[PDB]
Amino acid sequence: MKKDIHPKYEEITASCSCGNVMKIRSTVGHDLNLDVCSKCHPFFTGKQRDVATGGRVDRFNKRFNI
Amino acid sequence: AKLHDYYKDEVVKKLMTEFNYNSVMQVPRVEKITLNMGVGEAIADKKLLDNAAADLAAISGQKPLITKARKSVAGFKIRQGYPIGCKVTLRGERMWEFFERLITIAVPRIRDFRGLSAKSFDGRGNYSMGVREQIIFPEIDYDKVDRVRGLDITITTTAKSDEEGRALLAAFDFPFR
Amino acid sequence: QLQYTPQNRSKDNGRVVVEGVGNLMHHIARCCQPIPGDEIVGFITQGRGISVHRADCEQLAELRSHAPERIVDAVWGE
Amino acid sequence: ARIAGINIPDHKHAVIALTSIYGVGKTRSKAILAAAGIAEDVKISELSEGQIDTLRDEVAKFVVEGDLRREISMSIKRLMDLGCYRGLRHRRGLPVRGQRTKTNARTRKGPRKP
Amino acid sequence: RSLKKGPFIDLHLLKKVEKAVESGDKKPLRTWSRRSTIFPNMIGLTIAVHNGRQHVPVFVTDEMVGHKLGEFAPTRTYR
RNA sequence: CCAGGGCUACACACGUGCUACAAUGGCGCAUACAAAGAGAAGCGACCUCGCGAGAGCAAGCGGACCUCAUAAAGUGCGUCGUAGUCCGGAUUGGAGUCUGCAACUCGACUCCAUGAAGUCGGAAUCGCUAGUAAUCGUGGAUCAGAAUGCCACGGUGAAUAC
RNA sequence: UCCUCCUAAAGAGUAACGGAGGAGCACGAAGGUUGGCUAAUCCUGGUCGGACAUCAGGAGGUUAGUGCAAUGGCAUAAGCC
RNA sequence: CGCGGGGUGGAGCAGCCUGGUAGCUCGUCGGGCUCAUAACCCGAAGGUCGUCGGUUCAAAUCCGGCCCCCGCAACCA
User: Fold this and answer.
1) How many domains does chain B have?
2) CATH code for the domain of B89
3) How far apart are CA B94 and CA B89, in angstroms?
4) E74 and D78 in contact by Cβ < 8 A?
5) How far is the CA of B76 from the C1' of H54 (A)?
6) Residue D59 · residue D21 · CB < 8 Å
7) Which residue stretches belong to region Disordered (chain D)?
8) Is A64 in CB contact (< 8 Å) with chain E?
9) Chain H bases under 7 Å from protein CB?
């Protein structure tokens, strides 16, 4: 890297609310707080949310009872 | 750096037994990660491209290289040797750090995120993807950006097949639908 | 200038009696422009009534390739 | 903060704040803060981060944002693909719940233009 | 969202469809009972709802159950 | 005579009205003050369930006695800070409620969601001189159901007529 | 009047109211130099972005470019920084 | 044949001379005005710039071809 032409690249602490206190470089500002985490993100539980679709007969069985 | 080591360890070995690879060199490996933003709005505002520079710089940590046009086209109302976008061809450990700083946080931060394409590949394994807005990266004030200036990043692979490249990405887990 | 009540003739019905019943909204298929020739085995479209497709023709056959149970025959009435 | 998507303003009473998330009207809002045991009177900034987290902890239940969009948008596609009457209306960008198409209904059919 | 209790359809169409069930695969049905809603055994059938003046086939399939029959029989021919 | 459809169709045009465009305002909270009606396959308390629309229960009342039904603007405090914004409520989805054989075409209402145009309307044009206009709410007929329509009631309440 | 090719008969030259096209300038950098680089056009993927911006890879290979018309030449570049 | 000029909204004309946005007039349509039409008033749309090819990053425009209209010439004879 050439001298003085890049922002103050610097370590910061990614203090997520999920517990993952991953401290890594960046160049943000002071430090950093995140809601989730890559470790805690439902791209691995949002799957189940995606699955359940269709099945008219069933909800129909609710609107039934006879 | 960190997951780079992760690569040096698990990823390497895992792949050696994956694609029943022979020599360690036979393993594909990330090479150069490029960020690009074809702003294309600078044609009317030269003060705007700089804003884009501040963007990548914020996400890259290094001055982005601006891109001049390669050919004039009226359909996009531009001429030869004309500024039109900002890019960043970061490599080495820096690239690695950008990577961890990436997938571990920004990617999960994608609004309306579900998964990610498993399709997109150059025919050589080299990957491509497009972010939709600059805010997904923490360092951006969010509130201070005068405009949503999404972009797209590409990850070069020394992989030859699109497949072997994907497995390399799967090593780092790294989303995907 | 010599240019249809026939658009109301199918409405006059009797042009078809599918699988043992008439009336059924149907129409000519642009592919096998049927006429009271070699039968007709009308396809059942999800909308716009029946798609009479003469009898035996690729499209009439490809619908077999899809979900054929939708397809049924028809005499001609008059 | 960064709640779900980004209903993230401030100096906006928490309830009114959370209304801005897609898929959440005031009803759900109060249902949230109350269930999270907070205070609709508060301004998000003054609200402890140790609470805002409990707000995500709160909003997890109600189907929301992008997921909601995907569901409902899928429900509509479910209809136009269904070929059902209403599906046909959506296909025509005209009023669904039986109205006077002959007059107003301009909302559905788009602004007066032709 | 009507008649909370007793999903509704009628005997003439009901019974007739039942006869169509046990008798296996079936030919088109002549129903004017546009109001009637679809039921389990109605699935896969080629019942024809009488439309504004003449029948139109409604090949009921899975998804098309909760709805009333006429809902698949547009009455107003249009531009 | 019967079923179903149709009178609810929609590229557009006009009349007539409702609701808003907000701060003399929206919103939560507290609370004050009418008239005029209607009602017996009709009004149906209180009570219980339901967030609610309503539902089960069952008094009373064919009537200054019972009910429909606590009027609303207003008043107090609090909040909202001039934003398409806590304005606006259309549109749409989901879930329901009730009537009536029946709610798809094509009913009304509730809830959850959504949250459009609109930031006072070009030319033009109307009503109105008093308890009128303006603004608020109530009832009645029609009616199973089904109004912003209409008919009626009271509250609040001006300006200007040289 | 001047330049490019064809006519022109493989040296030069070579006419017609023969055939086709240009010039009457440009630039202090587009000049000198050392250093460095090399295209076009496409196929694939990629936010806005579409036939056509920018980016990444692949085929390809000078079909590119060369201040301006043609011609010969040009990567050791003369071409691009 | 020769020379010269021109071809743009429904009509008629600018802008083409200087390449990067096609403007004015009448007409048309919508509303208003009036008992009704006109006149008047308010608001709007609308033009592959003859065609074919070419040049350029870009063609109504710059170049050539063709078609059409029109002006001059069409001499000594």
Assistant:
1) 1
2) 3.30.1440.10
3) 11
4) no
5) 23
6) yes
7) 93-114
8) yes
9) 20, 57-59
CA dihedral sign, ordered D33, D39, D41, D47: negative
B76 CB inside 7 Å of strand H: no
Tell me if B156 is assigned to some domain. Answer: yes
| Domain hosting residue E30, numbered range | 1-79
Name the binding residues of A for Zn(2+).
16
Instruction: Round and report the angstrom distance from CA (E53) to C1' (G63).
Output: 68
CA pair distance C37, E27, nearest whole angstrom: 23
Domain interval for residue D57: 2-65
In this structure, is residue B68 part of a structural domain?
yes
- Structural domain boundaries enclosing B113: 3-172
Separation of alpha carbons C35 and E32, rounded Å = 30
Residue ranges with strand state E in B82-168: 83-91, 127-130, 152-157
Interface of B with D (CB under 8 A): 109, 111-114, 135, 142
Cβ neighbours of C1 (radius 10 Å): 2
Q: Checking DSSP bridges between strand C50-51 and strand C43-44, what pairing results, if any?
A: antiparallel
Is E40 within 8 Å of chain A by CB? yes
- Could you tell me the two tokens for E12? 């003439």
